[PDB]
Design a protein around this ligand. Sequence first.
Ligand SMILES: [Zn+2]
Ligand SMILES: [Zn+2]
Ligand SMILES: [Zn+2]
Ligand SMILES: [Zn+2]
Lengths: 77, 80
Amino acid sequence: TKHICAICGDRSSGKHYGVYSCEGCKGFFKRTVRKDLTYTCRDNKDCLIDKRQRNRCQYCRYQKCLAMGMKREAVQE
Amino acid sequence: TKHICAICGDRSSGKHYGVYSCEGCKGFFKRTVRKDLTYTCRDNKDCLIDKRQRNRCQYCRYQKCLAMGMKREAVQEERQ
DNA sequence: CTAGGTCAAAGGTCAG
DNA sequence: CTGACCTTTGACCTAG
Ligand SMILES: [Zn+2]
Ligand SMILES: [Zn+2]
Ligand SMILES: [Zn+2]
Ligand SMILES: [Zn+2]
């Protein structure tokens, strides 16, 4: 699992914010926290986050980052 | 100038789908791939694609995107 | 090692 | 439908 992103399942580049994640999910989490962005799900808050469809819903991607254990506290100034 | 669209000769906004192209040819290729659109040439499949006449034939514009090297694979899934 | 920065190249919108 | 004009993504690098 050291090699697989816990959020989308892409090739993981190491532990980012306490979770094994790809460069994509790391960057997304970083921008969300830094810019203090709020998202909305156009569906039923159960969108599938995988390599191909991770960008389909920002709300569901962020909730998966949190549920997998990504720490807001680990994003610095 | 090395900032020329390989499809139509308009000012290129960078590399789109592996080819130096204008914002017009980028959008056109994207919509064609996304919707899986099939076009028809009303002539002999050799219409001239340039800045002025790019919109004259959808079929010939798409065949030039492909012949120039535009990658169907580089068009990602819809986001909304 | 993993934190942050960068910027080319993806994405999107909506007036015409 | 088109394309000007805009935003977000993620591969890659470097400093701590
Ligand atoms: Zn990921
Ligand atoms: Zn969702
Ligand atoms: Zn063009
Ligand atoms: Zn034609």
